[PDB]
Subunit: 224 residues, 4 copies
């Protein structure tokens, strides 16, 4: 129901700019919304190769792909098929700052998600891990999701870590606001979503490209 | 297995010396709990400087990760450090610019089956019109703290964005960053993990003293994703 | 010299997005680079009226307009006529985050500045002063300017305040990186720039528009 | 005009109690300066807990805005509070996540022509490999602090992004946020303004004690733009 089926496809377009370097990424995906599982295949269409680590972009590419237990309000599935939008700041530990946003829609006819995104990054230091391309993946995490009932929005809060080639970690604070396109009659209570997001490089002579895989699962506090 | 010097049911004694915006105070107390269950109850009294002009909830998380239920198969850094115990240091950055520093030293007296917990707390710049100075805070919301090993140094770091829930139904955010150190060298270090916590306060003050009870339940876990 | 004259003109284009609301601003200006004085006339061409305070945008519209004392290296005038670029994060006290960047060029032939800018803002609270349009002006300030000699860039650091209708103030941290297009042989030592920037609303039935005026003056520490 | 209880040339005495990552210490000292010139020299000795395992520069700005040259025509909040004096509270957020809180109480003994300065300092989470624990800091760079009145409450707030300059020619940032309170009610409040500061340290330690001299020159100003 909700324009959703067990197995679905996705189409992506991101327009971005990081320290003045413009780029465009397009892509396609498949996954299973009720399992909170997705696979995403991206290609740098303009501005490639990227002079910064592509890992900074990965979490911009849809909380409809979350496994919500029975009994928990699913704000994101409830927003479908019209969809939902989000806005996020990324505050990195070395003073780099990004802003990101996206618009998610379901084409029922087509059993497809259309995802349009924007990304703006400033002040990545020249010899930092993003510009030296020393990143490998984000570490799995636990995001806290908070309702703001008076406004019909959710906020998310997670302290993320990007794992580095030498074994270190590079921290980034994510702060997100999530809004349905049509204000739903039901709001969840606060909860967690755990996430694991991985990148596999698929780049060839012609184009820079890669595959992301995500698994996300919502839960309540484990303490009675 | 006995080597930690711990038992199923134990007691604790507390002393805290603090200062929040120039107001000096001393808190003492006693507790009981079950360290392998990650459960404790703590009874505190303001023995100098009472009544406090700021919300006592800013203090609550100062009062012992030996009281965490660690699943088998995870390395328990804290109980591994017993009975000598461990120390920690924490920054608290509140959303309205207030800042606190806190530190503590935990030791086990095996003969008394009792923890000795000594702490220090300094806070600055709580706005006169905010929830701490207006005593509008009711409880910390239950949370999920990330714990990260620093194998180079044999310490752990913890990171958690905490929220105090307010009388009016609002929420007030505070970022905790903590460094956890054993008093002697862990042969073993954990992988990164989570600790979920739930910490509650019930006021027990009367005409003689400002007093309150805390209760904590804390449980460690790994990522739920394969 | 440097493609500069005492009296010059400017042309502006900004493409922006703040909490998903797209907009385009164009404009024209006149001022005097050596006096650090400029007047800027802006019009919201797409996306108007703006649903957020326009004051958040004002400091995106050129450090060529700084009065540098004799004896102090002028990184910005030295970059002319090719120009300079900059990237900035704006961290507001209520969790709102913006990223901004711009590209400045001098048309010598035309005695004109071409200024192209981008602005992305997320997470302005609905009942905050930006969305309630409770702002009047930025308070004059003192920015610290620091050289990074190994890289040929400058960083700037200023804690800004937006004055509110009720008499309050709303703080925003500015962190900027400034880069010449052609790496200059000379770098300044650290210094201050003081700035005063004002807005006058010029809006009519057809379009939202306003005028900015800036005066900026560089100095060294006043302590021997 | 005499009402402040100050004179052209005055002395000071200091005591600081502190703790940085569990290392306790006490510093005492003496000073001389000229409060209307905004100039002072301060001589400090580590009397308990020495030698310090962290850079003493993290402490320097703990040691009195009565020592500011205010131009005529500006309201001098600090000298207006004399001779009773004033108090302050400050957060120090360093760029590598270390956090300090500091507070002090300044009083004038008019009979001794001497300031009594009592302070407290708590710091946490300096990385073992950073410049503070490696003693790589040489001096704070001269700065420009914004001072803002809060007329509702009769306090001032100050805001300054400070940088410690390192042996290697690098720089290490620290955000200072301070609240300044007079001990009794200012009939008068300043408009917002700037204070430019220059604070220097020269080590004077020997085989017996860790000791150093600070010197400060601080001058208030208004915006330079019409």
């Amino acid at each position: 129901k909700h324009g959703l089926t067990k197995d679905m496809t996705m189409k992506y377009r991101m327009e971005g700019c990081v320290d003045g370097h413009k780029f465009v990424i397009t892509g396609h995906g498949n996954g299973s919304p009720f399992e909170g599982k997705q696979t995403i295949n991206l290609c740098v269409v303009e501005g490639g190769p990227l002079p910064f680590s592509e890992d900074i972009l990965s979490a911009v590419f849809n909380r409809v792909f979350t496994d919500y237990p029975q009994g928990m309000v699913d704000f994101f599935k409830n927003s479908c098929p019209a969809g939902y939008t989000w806005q996020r700041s990324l505050l990195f530990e070395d003073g780099a700052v990004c802003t990101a946003s996206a618009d998610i829609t379901v084409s029922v006819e087509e059993n497809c998600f259309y995802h349009e995104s924007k990304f703006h990054g400033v002040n990545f230091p020249a010899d930092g891990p993003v510009m030296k391309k020393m990143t490998i993946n984000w570490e799995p995490c636990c995001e806290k999701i908070i309702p703001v009932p008076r406004q019909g929005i959710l906020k998310g809060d997670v302290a993320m870590y990007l794992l580095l080639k030498d074994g270190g970690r590079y921290r980034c604070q994510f702060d997100t606001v999530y809004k349905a396109k049509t204000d739903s009659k039901k709001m969840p209570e606060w909860h967690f979503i755990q996430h694991k997001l991985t990148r596999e490089d698929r780049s060839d002579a012609k184009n820079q490209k890669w595959q992301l895989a995500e698994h996300s699962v919502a839960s309540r506090s484990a303490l009675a």
